[PDB]
Symmetry: none
């Protein structure tokens, strides 16, 4: 079958930290394709004058003609900050049963997994790949002890089947943050080379994140 990744994020904006992390994990997992999955949030949770539509277009600009990288907009086509399990169920019915699904998770996010909705059917539909980094600790709550026990494999190449396991991977992400880029733009400064050149171009063309 195919090997599909899912990379979820707010992407406000998408930057080279995200993009370098998606290139790397596609290569480490030999994915057919890695889908960036821009997250839904309440409209008043959006950066003022940056719509969920423009977060979407910037990711689109980001993956434009990039090998093995796509954008899944399906959470933004819903109605509210839906559930990842809904997204997992929806992607699944579009895949073959032998296709394998990998959902990229940052360590800090994974440590709150039992605070997600129906969090125990997640692995029913995919494998979870948890992003280890310089910063984000690596000792989970007891709440996750038995999950790691029943489901983790230490070799990311070890993952078998369409879904069901958890592995860990290591990246050294460039130290680039959406918050820092928003601050620079607000001060009329250049975020050139902090973001993909096509995303830069979109941000400048549409004059995004500009000081009130």
């Amino acid at each position: 079958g195919k090997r599909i990744g899912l990379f979820g994020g707010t992407f406000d904006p998408v930057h080279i930290g995200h993009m370098r992390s998606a290139v790397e994990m596609a290569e480490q997992f030999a994915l057919d394709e890695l889908r960036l999955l821009p997250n839904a949030r309440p409209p008043h949770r959006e950066t003022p004058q940056v719509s969920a539509a423009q977060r979407l277009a910037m990711v689109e600009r980001a993956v434009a003609g990039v090998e093995r990288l796509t954008v899944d907009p399906r959470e933004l086509q819903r109605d509210k900050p839906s559930y990842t399990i809904d997204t997992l169920e929806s992607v699944r019915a579009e895949l073959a049963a032998d296709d394998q699904l990998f959902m990229l998770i940052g360590w800090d996010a994974f440590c709150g997994l039992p605070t997600w909705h129906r969090w125990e059917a997640l692995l029913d539909h995919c494998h979870i790949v948890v992003l280890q980094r310089p910063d984000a600790d690596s000792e989970p709550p007891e709440s996750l002890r038995d999950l790691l026990a029943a489901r983790s494999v230490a070799d990311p190449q070890a993952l078998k089947g369409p879904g069901g396991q958890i592995t860990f991977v290591w990246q050294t992400p460039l130290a680039v943050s959406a918050t820092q880029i928003r601050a620079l733009l607000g001060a009329g400064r250049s975020v050139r080379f902090l973001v993909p050149d096509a995303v830069l171009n979109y941000i400048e063309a549409h004059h995004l994140y500009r000081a009130p």
Copy 2:
């Protein structure tokens, strides 16, 4: 025409949480002026030995020399308190036909709006801006479902014309409350830097909220 804001509340006392939220909304909506609106209440629900007129002075001290901020005392210059809609009509008679008016209110205060007088006419005279924050839900009563349906606009910069629409905004206000502040002052402790300096000195000079 001008963009006019209304920000209601008891202000017992006015403090930085109130004031930072004003600054922020007057900025977010590019207002010409934001009016702090001290509300009237029965004399017996005043804090003992802090009057309706001293609540007013403290808000005056708070906006003295601040840009875009003023005080409308109109609800305190009446028999007893009244209803918001009357204030709306009164403000809207001193206003130009195309002046835009924005009444800021909290989320929980928002959910109780069907229990306000002539609540369906409120929006005849202003747009309503609703303050969302952490630890103030976002699941309105059924009794408001048709209202949001007829009037909500996602994009707070999309409010059009003099009034008639509702939109939601996000703030994370300082962790500061009047209740907390009255308690401190009761214990003779300093509330400096919980309130504007002006207000601090008014409270200290008139020995407000002292233990009786």
Copy 3:
């Protein structure tokens, strides 16, 4: 065997609201003994100049001469703070096999149960009695949906055996809070008739909660 309740809390200080709830629980459940369980916390989270041993002293004063009601200081002694499940295994180590143990917890405290350490093991040792009250929600975390549909008993007299089940009880506690009681005492005011009489004398005789 015996019917024995546990009622945890910080009790800073124990007051009339807490003690009435105890009295009502013990009656209801026909308890042989109800143990007020003051909880441990780091020394830095205590109220200034009111120590753990003083919290326990007040609780002893509140139950002195009140048959059926007693104090358990076990979570206090132990060098550093406590996990409920450990408190339960120790209580159980002293209790005959057929003793019935009832742990009383508030609603909000209840929904957060999936955060407690080894939360799925708590009911190995006791029944859990949930205190439902006005101004206390009626919608719990999805995390608990299994547990409730697994272990709920609608009728409190239907708890059977030493433990294993949960049930919900209604009460309308007195409009008193230790936060308010601490602020009154900081102002030099009286809190007589908000705390039990013997608690009032202790507070006054040791000048607890006064202004620094």
Copy 4:
């Protein structure tokens, strides 16, 4: 003898988070004097166009007319950076041997104490008061487990003598950061009510933190 606090910070700028902290600490500790001590750093480590002098000017504005709160410029009056043990040795020289010195450190900084220069020397000259607050954590390095075993006291009132012990104090600091203020300023936004009013005045007077 006197009771005197030292509160070191970078203060870039001093904001209402720092000042509320200093007010609560003086109160708590019954300090005759709390001296804010701005940190020296190399020139290329300053904020562009905001000089150490100007960091010191803002702290002076912040404490003006606040009795008991003062500033100590002596680390700036020295060449390249000071080591805090040198800072305390020089303070001490000036005080009565029986004056008590309290040095306020936030939990995260204290956690790296064994890295500071001649770290085991500091308590010769003062008490260390380590502030805990909602965000760091409660777990230390091995490297501090014995200093803590040897030198701490659970009660701040427990601090005895001119120096020698370590204690821990709780506060809920307002969620203000100098990073967030610098970005807002760089964007032409107001930081009114996020900084003390006399600091706001100085910032605007001198157009500090203004975009290039």
